Amino acid sequence: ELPIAPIGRIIKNAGAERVSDDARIALAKVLEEMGEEIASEAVKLAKHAGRKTIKAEDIELARKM
Amino acid sequence: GELPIAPIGRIIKNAGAERVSDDARIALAKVLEEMGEEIASEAVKLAKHAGRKTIKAEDIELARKMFK
């Protein structure tokens, strides 16, 4: 998912003067893919640690990939 | 920030999480927004040097390589 209107606002917040629709669609896809990969790693960290609930520390460690 | 939290908690559940803390949802939204801003900042520089003010998909797809 990720809805594309908030993604276009992220690009504006970085200073973009004009934003094409395809740039919004592309950045939504990139952030979904990264989100999925970080989440996947975080579920495994948790399981390797012996845990069912995903915590912030799981996300923070997974992000360093 | 700009990202809504509901879709981000669904990303974690759909990755296999049994349970997700609220702090974890917020952490993941903050990480993705920051990564998004850094990619977009670089995309803006790529477009300016191509002589454009409009950000294109190709600018995002090149800038994302900063995180490979």
Side-chain angles (χ1 to χ4, degrees), chain A residues 1-54 56-65, chain B residues 1-21 24-29 31-44 46-47 49-55 57-68:
Chain A
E1 181 204 355
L2 306 183
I4 64 183
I7 302 295
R9 293 170 195 148
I10 291 168
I11 302 166
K12 298 202 110 100
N13 288 164
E17 278 215 278
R18 312 184 178 147
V19 180
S20 73
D21 210 25
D22 36 79
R24 310 198 286 181
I25 290 167
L27 185 57
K29 290 172 166 140
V30 165
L31 294 182
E32 292 157 27
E33 169 139 24
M34 291 182 357
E36 284 180 27
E37 298 161 311
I38 294 165
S40 182
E41 180 60 44
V43 170
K44 287 175 202 177
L45 262 43
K47 179 185 196 274
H48 268 125
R51 213 144 33 64
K52 161 188 167 200
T53 295
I54 289 58
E57 63 96 20
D58 295 322
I59 298 307
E60 327 271 48
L61 285 182
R63 112 236 247 134
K64 335 264 346 168
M65 273 50 266
Chain B
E2 307 288 345
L3 294 181
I5 304 300
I8 302 301
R10 277 188 219 110
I11 293 176
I12 304 173
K13 280 176 165 165
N14 290 338
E18 214 156 65
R19 199 164 167 123
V20 179
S21 79
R25 293 179 258 169
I26 300 155
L28 183 54
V31 162
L32 292 176
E33 189 146 349
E34 186 164 9
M35 296 177 91
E37 288 179 353
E38 294 297 353
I39 292 163
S41 283
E42 300 300 341
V44 170
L46 287 159
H49 291 271
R52 288 177 286 96
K53 291 279 128 259
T54 298
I55 309 310
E58 290 77 8
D59 302 315
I60 297 298
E61 296 290 341
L62 187 41
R64 74 179 295 185
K65 306 166 157 210
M66 68 196 289
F67 293 110
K68 326 210 3 197

